[PDB]
Every structure is written in structure tokens, then in C-alpha cells.
Amino acid sequence: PDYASGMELITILEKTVSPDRLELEAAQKFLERAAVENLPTFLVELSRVLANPGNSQVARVAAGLQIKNSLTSKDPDIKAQYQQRWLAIDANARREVKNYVLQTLGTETYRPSSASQCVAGIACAEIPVSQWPELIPQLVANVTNPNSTEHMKESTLEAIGYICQDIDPEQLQDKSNEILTAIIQGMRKEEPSNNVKLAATNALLNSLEFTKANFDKESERHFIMQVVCEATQCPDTRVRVAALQNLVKIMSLYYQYMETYMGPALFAITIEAMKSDIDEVALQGIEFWSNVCDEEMDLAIEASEAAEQGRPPEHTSKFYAKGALQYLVPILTQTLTKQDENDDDDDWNPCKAAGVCLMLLSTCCEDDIVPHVLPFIKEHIKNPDWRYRDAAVMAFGSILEGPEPNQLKPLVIQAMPTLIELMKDPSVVVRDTTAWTVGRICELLPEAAINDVYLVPNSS
Amino acid sequence: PDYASGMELITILEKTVSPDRLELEAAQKFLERAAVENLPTFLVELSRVLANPGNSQVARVAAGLQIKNSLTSKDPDIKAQYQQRWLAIDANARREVKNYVLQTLGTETYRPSSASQCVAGIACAEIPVSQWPELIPQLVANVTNPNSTEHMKESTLEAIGYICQDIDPEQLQDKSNEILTAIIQGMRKEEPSNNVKLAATNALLNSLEFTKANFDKESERHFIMQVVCEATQCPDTRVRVAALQNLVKIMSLYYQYMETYMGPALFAITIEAMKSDIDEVALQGIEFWSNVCDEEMDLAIEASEAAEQGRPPEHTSKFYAKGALQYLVPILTQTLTKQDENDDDDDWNPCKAAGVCLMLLSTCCEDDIVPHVLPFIKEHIKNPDWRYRDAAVMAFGSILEGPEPNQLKPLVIQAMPTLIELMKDPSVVVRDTTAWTVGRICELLPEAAINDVYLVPNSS
Numbered sequence: 001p002d003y004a005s006g007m008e009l010i011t012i013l014e015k016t017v018s019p020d021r022l023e024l025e026a027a028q029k030f031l032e033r034a035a036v037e038n039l040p041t042f043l044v045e046l047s048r049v050l051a052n053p054g055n056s057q058v059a060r061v062a063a064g065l066q067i068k069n070s071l072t073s074k075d076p077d078i079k080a081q082y083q084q085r086w087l088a089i090d091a092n093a094r095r096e097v098k099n100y101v102l103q104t105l106g107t108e109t110y111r112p113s114s115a116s117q118c119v120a121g122i123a124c125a126e127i128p129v130s131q132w133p134e135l136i137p138q139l140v141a142n143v144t145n146p147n148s149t150e151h152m153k154e155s156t157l158e159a160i161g162y163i164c165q166d167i168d169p170e171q172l173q174d175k176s177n178e179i180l181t182a183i184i185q186g187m188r189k190e191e192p193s194n195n196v197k198l199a200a201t202n203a204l205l206n207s208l209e210f211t212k213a214n215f216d217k218e219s220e221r222h223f224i225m226q227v228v229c230e231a232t233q234c235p236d237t238r239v240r241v242a243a244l245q246n247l248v249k250i251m252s253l254y255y256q257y258m259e260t261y262m263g264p265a266l267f268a269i270t271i272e273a274m275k276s277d278i279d280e281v282a283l284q285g286i287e288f289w290s291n292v293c294d295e296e297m298d299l300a301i302e303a304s305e306a307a308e309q310g311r312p313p314e315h316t317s318k319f320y321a322k323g324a325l326q327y328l329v330p331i332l333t334q335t336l337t338k339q340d341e342n343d344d345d346d347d348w349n350p351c352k353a354a355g356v357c358l359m360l361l362s363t364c365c366e367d368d369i370v371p372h373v374l375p376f377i378k379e380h381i382k383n384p385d386w387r388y389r390d391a392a393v394m395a396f397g398s399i400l401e402g403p404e405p406n407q408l409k410p411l412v413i414q415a416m417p418t419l420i421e422l423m424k425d426p427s428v429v430v431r432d433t434t435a436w437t438v439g440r441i442c443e444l445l446p447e448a449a450i451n452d453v454y455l456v457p458n459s460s
Numbered sequence: 461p462d463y464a465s466g467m468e469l470i471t472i473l474e475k476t477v478s479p480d481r482l483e484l485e486a487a488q489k490f491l492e493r494a495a496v497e498n499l500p501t502f503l504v505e506l507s508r509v510l511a512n513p514g515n516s517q518v519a520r521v522a523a524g525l526q527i528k529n530s531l532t533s534k535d536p537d538i539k540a541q542y543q544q545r546w547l548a549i550d551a552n553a554r555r556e557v558k559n560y561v562l563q564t565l566g567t568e569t570y571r572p573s574s575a576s577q578c579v580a581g582i583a584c585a586e587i588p589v590s591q592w593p594e595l596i597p598q599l600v601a602n603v604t605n606p607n608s609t610e611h612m613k614e615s616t617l618e619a620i621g622y623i624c625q626d627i628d629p630e631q632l633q634d635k636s637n638e639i640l641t642a643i644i645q646g647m648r649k650e651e652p653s654n655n656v657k658l659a660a661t662n663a664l665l666n667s668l669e670f671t672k673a674n675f676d677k678e679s680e681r682h683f684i685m686q687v688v689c690e691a692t693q694c695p696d697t698r699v700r701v702a703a704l705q706n707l708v709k710i711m712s713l714y715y716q717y718m719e720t721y722m723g724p725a726l727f728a729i730t731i732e733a734m735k736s737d738i739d740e741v742a743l744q745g746i747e748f749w750s751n752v753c754d755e756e757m758d759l760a761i762e763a764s765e766a767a768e769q770g771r772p773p774e775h776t777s778k779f780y781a782k783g784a785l786q787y788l789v790p791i792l793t794q795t796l797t798k799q800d801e802n803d804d805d806d807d808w809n810p811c812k813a814a815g816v817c818l819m820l821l822s823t824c825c826e827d828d829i830v831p832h833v834l835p836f837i838k839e840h841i842k843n844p845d846w847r848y849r850d851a852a853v854m855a856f857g858s859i860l861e862g863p864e865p866n867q868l869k870p871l872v873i874q875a876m877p878t879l880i881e882l883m884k885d886p887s888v889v890v891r892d893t894t895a896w897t898v899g900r901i902c903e904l905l906p907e908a909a910i911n912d913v914y915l916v917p918n919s920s
């Protein structure tokens with residue numbers, strides 16, 4: 001035998017990144033040819049260049065990439081054949097590659113771990129047939145081990161994350177406690193690394209698909225909630241945002257369990273997130289309450305159908321939205337003044353999210369939302385600042401669906417003159433928003449409009 | 461209790477329906493007292509009155525009802541103690557009642573089987589603790605046995621139906637193949653009775669809550685789909701409607717498995733349903749496609765978020781709506797001409813469902829829907845028949861959300877004059893719908909309106 005084998009491989013792997021066209025081309029031609037020539041040996045040789053910390057970063061990433069593109073594809077059908085092509089190679093050549101990949105975890109210095117993707121690619125194919133019985137225990141160990149380094153834990157958590165989102169939820173339900181233990185471990189308040197924390201929280205979000213049994217146990221649930229709430233306090237905003245994302249999904253998945261955390265934690269955290277000057281954070285706060293509105297609206301319909309059938313509803317609402325109303329609305333109307341200057345009305349910022357939330361809130365809380373919004377409207381409807389003038393018009397249009405029509409009509413009649421005047425406003429943004437609101441009126445309250453105004457062809 | 465006592469029980473039971481107040485009064489006083497006095501024997505004596513084909517219909521029904529109201533209640537808490545009180549009676553007395561109830565199946569002549577309700581009440585209490593291990597096999601046999609009569613099969617299927625909707629889905633997953641076998645059996649295209657078919661199809665609908673394992677098996681799924689599709693061809697409309705209802709639910713529960721049946725059966729069946737003069741049938745067809753639009757819209761968002769995260773979506777859409785568009789739209793716009801003379805205060809008829817479907821279709825297929833709708837609009841916008849004139853206005857308003865704005869603006873500009881004129885149309889219906897569409901415009905395309913229309917206060 002001769003090491004020339006791996007030597008040349010590493011030379012070509014480094015050319016797939018060459019500024020030259022010829023080398024880059026010849027590089028891929030060779031690689032592809034070697035795959036065809038003898039894949040099992042090809043992948044074993046690549047898993048060796050990857051697991052070798054002595055090799056240059058470029059060579060190791062290029063090696064991971066090749067291993068990656070051998071087990072997965074953007075095409076569900078192609079990806080399906082690769083997994084069969086992989087299961088095709090004899091167990092021996094595979095245990096070799098699987099071990100090298102797992103041994104690469106923690107031996108990488110570059111940011112994105114190329115080993116984690118490879119673990120996921122192989123797990124997706126072997127786990128469904130119980131071919132990698134030592135993967136989970138290994139991964140869990142890598143995280144719970146006190147001597148494990150940041151890279152070791154971070155890369156392992158990334159791998160758990162990929163697995164949670166690439167594998168069929170039913171395939172993981174059987175190993176939920178293990179995976180969750182590793183995930184929760186990486187999220188403990190005492191974690192020294194913000195990168196480890198981020199990787200763990202991102203993975204939790206993906207695991208919410210198969211951890212029902214875990215959330216149904218009032219004992220574990222308390223811990224998961226404590227760890228997630230603490231993560232919302234982390235100084236690294238990426239961790240904070242990922243934590244909020246979990247609360248957002250958990251709220252729409254376990255509304256009945258939230259009464260224990262709502263008043264003690266959730267309320268203060270999300271309300272504070274809605275007030276953040278950081279957009280990614282504020283959006284997360286707004287979605288949280290948007291979800292509560294969806295949930296409580298469904299429950300109201302449940303209570304209704306149950307009544308008409310002469311019985312108590314199976315589930316009841318704790319009316320979180322109605323209770324938060326006085327704190328939510330001021331925050332939302334103020335966010336309305338943070339509208340974008342341009343017509344990129346396809347960009348999703350707090351201002352647009354807030355507007356949507358105010359409407360959900362109106363259809364959810366109905367008659368109650370009006371008392372909270374009117375003051376802001378009457379106060380800014382005629383404000384010199386277009387940002388407030390616009391927000392006022394927007395807010396008025398946001399409450400037209402939900403409240404009792406008989407309570408809105410007088411508001412409409414009393415405001416129409418201003419609206420008609422606002423259609424000629426100096427600001428383009430105010431004009432458009434006003435057309436929107438009049439539209440909401442002619443649309444939800446035709447009578448109040450039809451009679452307090454008739455249409456007439458314009459003149460340009 | 462001797463023959464004489466049993467005879468008075470039957471006399472009392474027949475009085476609970478007496479035109480007299482005293483008798484009906486005394487009757488329930490006695491029955492309740494007998495329950496208190498000695499429940500176990502009261503229930504055994506009632507199950508004997510019910511099981512006896514010789515007893516008058518009134519007495520057998522009154523007996524079933526007494527047995528029913530002793531095991532269930534509309535109050536979840538009271539219902540809970542009744543089930544505990546029943547489990548309290550010694551197995552011997554219960555086995556007697558259970559046997560008499562099961563023996564009543566098929567021995568009834570009257571329409572609603574009172575025995576099936578009693579089977580359900582007992583099953584809900586005993587199944588959760590594995591106390592009636594011979595119930596399922598018995599029921600299955602009652603249906604699959606070739607010599608079984610119509611009433612035998614019909615009453616048994618109703619009982620299976622009640623169980624499917626009264627018992628916790630988790631409690632039935634373990635006996636899914638059995639229940640499904642009996643259900644599918646009652647639905648075989650060769651079934652002589654339309655009443656048996658209806659009872660079986662209604663039962664399938666209820667079982668969709670716990671038969672996931674059954675649908676995940678490519679083998680059984682083929683059969684379930686075959687039997688449900690055949691049922692949609694039954695000459696008895698009730699069966700037809702129930703079958704369609706199943707397809708509707710199955711579509712929203714198993715979109716990923718539909719590719720095998722969509723082209724071969726589903727497409728032609730539902731499209732034909734949409735064209736029916738029978739409203740209950742047409743609604744079912746429209747709901748089917750409304751569901752497909754919901755499903756594919758969610759998938760589109762899934763593909764989007766997956767892209768922004770640099771990866772292939774876990775699930776992909778087959779774009780059924782886009783493909784059916786040229787067949788769907790013409791049937792929908794035609795249904796818009798079937799509007800009720802201004803609803804009995806918002807009834808849910810084909811016309812209103814169709815309008816909703818057109819909207820979903822527009823946001824789902826965007827750009828593409830316009831070419832399909834415009835012709836209808838331009839052709840009927842000025843039609844002497846208000847039904848078509850209104851439909852044209854409605855259709856124009858239905859496509860404003862979804863297609864590209866720059867593609868709609870010119871259409872609005874070109875149509876506004878007619879819309880403003882339509883606001884003064886002789887027909888109330890036309891006027892109302894027109895107000896809605898202009899609202900949709902003022903709402904979705906502010907600029908195209910703000911510069912082309914004027915609101916003038918009514919000086920009237």
C-alpha cells in the first residue's frame with residue numbers, strides 16, 4: 001500500500017476552491033469519477049481527511065461536503081436513492097466512516113461543523129432501520145461530559161439539531177428522553193458558552209415535534225420552561241431570539257399548561273420583548289400574543305358549539321388576551337409609528353406585525369378593544385407628525401372587525417369627514433393607509449358609509 | 461324480580477310517555493326510586509325489557525333511555541361518576557346487562573336503535589379498563605357475517621360509530637384494524653342496504669381521529685380509499701355526502717398520500733360534486749378544493765422558510781390547485797350566479813362557499829387566476845340578469861388579493877367607472893356586492909383608487 005492515496009485526494013480536495021477554472025473543473029471530474037470507480041472506499045478515504053486535524057481547513061470542509069452530497073439532495077427522490085445507495089455499502093465500510101465522522105466532533109476549529117451535517121446524513125438513513133445503535137448515547141455523552149470542550153458540545157448539539165429536523169418525528173419519539181437530556185444540558189443557565197447555548201436552543205425548537213410525552217409530565221415541563229425562560233435573558237441576542245421562538249411554539253402547542261408560567265414569567269418576558277428596539281426580538285414578542293389570540297379565539301368557538309349542544313366545553317380559555325389588553329395595546333399603537341418610509345410593503349417589520357396583531361386582538365376581544373384604542377386615535381388622528389397621524393388611521397381601521405357593529409357605526413360617522421380629508425393628506429403613506437381604512441369600512445360596515453357618503457368619479 | 465314485577469316495570473316504562481301529567485310524574489318517581497332502591501337489578505331488568513322483541517316499541521325505547529341515562533350525562537363530571545358507579549356493580553350483574561344489550565342488536569324494528577346507545581355508554585366506561593374484551597370481536601362478527609340482517613349490521617355499525625366518537629382515540633388505536641374491518645365491510649360497494657352503507661360511512665368519519673397507523677400502511681390505505689370512492693357513487697345522496705365528507709377530511713389529514721388517488725379518482729369525483737344541483741353535495745366538492753388550497757398555501761410557506769434557511773423543504777406540494785385551475789374556476793364563477801335573494805342572514809350555501817373558494821384560489825395561484833376570471837367578468841359585468849351582473853362584480857373582487865398588484869391596477873382603473881355606476885344599480889344585491897368589491901380595492905390597491913375616486917358626504 002501507499003499513502004499517495006490520501007495525499008492526492010487532499011490535493012484535489014483543495015483545488016475545488018482554486019481561483020482557476022481548469023483545476024476547479026478537473027478537481028470535480030476526478031472526485032465524481034472516484035465516486036463511480038469505488039464509492040465505499042471513496043467515502044472511507046474522505047472520512048479520514050475530515051477526521052484529520054492536521055489537514056488544512058479547506059481540505060476538511062471539502063471532504064465533509066463530498067461526504068454530505070453523497071447522502072442527501074434537495075430532491076426528495078434523489079435523496080431517497082442516496083440513502084438506499086448508502087445502506088447498500090457493507091456494514092464494515094460504514095462503521096469505519098461513521099466512527100471517523102463521530103471522532104471529528106470537537107476536532108474542528110472553523111465555525112460551521114462539517115462533521116455534524118455528515119452525522120445527520122447518515123443518521124437519516126441508518127436510524128430508520130436501527131443501524132446506528134450507538135449514535136444517540138455517544139451524542140448525549142459528548143454533551144453531558146464535564147470535560148467536553150466548547151467545540152465538542154457545540155458541534156454535537158448542531159448534529160442533534162439537524163437530526164431533529166431531518167428525521168421523521170416518529171423515528172425519534174423512541175429516544176426523546178435521551179435527546180432532550182442532551183439538549184437541556186446544553187441550555188443550562190450555567191453554560192459558559194453562548195455558542196453552546198444557541199446550538200442547544202435551536203435544537204429544542206426542532207424537538208418540539210416529538211416531545212409530547214415529555215411536556216405532558218408536569219415534572220419535566222417545569223424544568224424545560226425554566227431553562228427556556230432563563231435563555232430569554234441571555235446577553236447574546238441570537239440565544240434570546242431562539243428562546244422566544246420556543247415560547248412562541250410552545251404556546252401554540254400547550255396552551256392548557258401555560259397558566260403556571262403566564263403570570264410568573266411569560267407575561268413579563270414577552271411584554272418586554274415587544275418593547276425591544278431590536279426587530280427580531282419584537283417580532284417574536286408580537287407573534288407570541290398573536291398565537292394566544294388564535295388559541296383563545298378557537299376556544300371561544302369551542303365554548304359556543306358546546307353550549308348549543310347543551311354541554312360544557314372540553315377545554316376553556318384563561319382569557320390571557322383580554323387580561324393583557326391594557327398593556328398590549330399601548331405597545332402596539334406605538335409600534336405603528338415605526339412604519340417603513342418606502343413602499344417595501346412586503347417587508348415584515350414590527351410595525352406591520354403590530355398592525356396584524358391589533359386586528360387579531362380586535363376579533364378576539366371584540367367590544368373590549370375599542371375602549372383601549374379610541375383614546376390613541378382621537379389623540380393622534382390630527383397630529384402634525386405623519387408617523388402618528390398614520391398610526392391613528394391604521395389603528396381605527398384595525399378595530400372594525402370584531403366589535404359590535406352598533407358600537408362602530410357612530411365612530412365611523414364621526415370620523416368619516418376626517419378620513420375623506422385624510423385622503424388628500426400631504427403624506428403618501430397616510431393617504432394609502434386612509435384608503436385602506438375607508439376600504440375596511442365600506443367593506444365591514446357598508447351602511448355607515450353608503451349613507452354618509454356616495455362615490456363620485458375623480459378628476460386628474 | 462318475578463314475571464309480575466317485570467310486567468309492572470313495562471307498564472311504568474310506557475307511562476313515561478303518557479299524555480297525562482300524574483302518570484308521567486308517578487312513572488319517573490318510581491323509576492328513579494327503583495334505581496336508588498337497587499340499581500344493579502334495575503339495570504338487569506331494563507336490559508331484559510329492551511332485549512325482548514315482544515315488548516312494545518315505547519317500552520323498549522324507554523328502557524334503553526333509562527339504561528343510557530344511568531351511564532352517561534352531558535356534564536363531564538356527572539358522566540364520570542356514573543361510569544364509576546357502573547364499574548362498582550359486580551361483574552356478574554354487568555355481564556348480564558351487557559349480554560342483553562348485545563342481544564338486542566338486530567332485534568329492533570324501529571328506526572333509531574336504542575341498544576347501540578347503551579353499548580356506547582357501557583363501552584365508554586369498561587373499555588378504558590379492559591372490562592369488555594368480547595365487545596369488539598362480537599361487533600365485528602355481527603357485520604362480517606354473511607347471514608347478518610340489515611338491522612343487525614345497521615345497529616352494530618351505529619354502535620361502532622358512537623364508540624368511535626365517545627371514546628378517547630388512544631383507547632381505540634389498539635383495536636383499529638378490527639373496527640376498520642367492520643367499518644369497511646359495511647361500506648363494500650356490494651352492500652344491499654343504503655342504510656347499512658350510511659351507518660358505515662358515518663362511522664368511518666369518526667374513526668379518522670385514531671386510525672393514523674392504518675392510513676400510514678400503503679396496503680390498507682388503498683382499500684379504504686377504494687371503498688370511500690365507491691361510496692361517492694351510491695345512488696342514496698346521504699351515503700354520497702358522507703363519503704365526500706370523508707374525502708374532505710382525508711385530504712386535510714393525508715395530503716402526502718393523495719398523489720395516488722388524485723388523478724385516478726379524486727379529481728373527477730370532486731369536480732363532478734361541485735357541479736351538482738344538490739347543495740349538500742356541491743358544498744362538499746367546494747370544501748375539498750378549499751382544503752387543498754389551504755394545504756398547498758402552508759406548503760408554499762414551508763418551502764419559503766426552508767429556502768431562507770438554506771435547505772430543501774421537508775414536504776413539497778404537488779400543486780393540485782394550480783393544475784385544476786382551468787376546470788375549477790368556470791364551475792365556481794357559474795355557481796356565483798346561484799346567489800340566494802340576499803341570504804336568510806348569511807346562510808352557508810354553494811354561492812358563498814364558491815366565492816370564498818375563488819378567493820383562496822386567487823391567493824394560492826395568484827398571477828394565473830386572472831386570465832381565467834377576467835373573461836367571465838368582462839362578459840357579465842353589464843348583463844341584464846342581476847344574478848350574472850352580481851356574480852361578475854363578486855368575481856372581480858375575489859381576485860384582488862394574490863395576483864401581482866401591477867397586473868390588477870389597470871383592471872381597476874378600467875373598471876372603476878362601471879363600479880361607481882353599479883353602486884347605483886337597481887338591484888340591492890348588486891349594490892351591496894359592489895360596495896364590497898370597491899372596498900376590496902380601496903383596501904388592497906389604495907393607489908389605484910385614491911387617484912380615481914372621490915367620497916362625497918351625503919347632504920341628504
